[PDB]
Amino acid sequence: RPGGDTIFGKIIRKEIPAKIIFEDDQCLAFHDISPQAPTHFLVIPKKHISQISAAEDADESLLGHLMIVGKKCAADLGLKKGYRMVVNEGSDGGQSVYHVHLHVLGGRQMNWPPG
Template identity: 45%
Template structure:
């Protein structure tokens, strides 16, 4: 996707504070962190959201999850972290490129959801 902001970050057209890259995924610090540790992990190939994945995407999804613990530990969240994938409008997805937030820090993250 030519205009996708995350695709442009992967291609180096938009600067980022990269923390990890391999043949499948790219990870960088969020520009508006919500916690002391806030990293985005994205597939290098454009996938709009978790709602659009196919069985062929299993290797990249597995890689996203498998690098999460190392990224969290290396970036100040050795005692735990939260991995979040927002999906679609109802799920709060703001960028139409699959991405996982790794959030944490020295203090507990807090409740997962507000009770209604």
């Protein structure tokens, strides 16, 4: 609209406040309001891609860019002992917002299975 019609679109357009960590021309990172670890933030693309299953071949760089920004923000937030990155797709994956988002969690030992 630009930014999509989900709550993420409101965050991107600054219609509703968020604890934004970093922002560039392609994405934005902000803290998850329901953290599952001491540090839990999300990196979302400004381009609205509803689900990872709908991403096209041309979205390759953009998707890779979310992971680069994620590792940079994780280092900046002091997650030197490690972290886990997660992308949820659909019902079975637990996707709650239909705008592609990358979860980054750390600050504690992450267990296995990953859910």
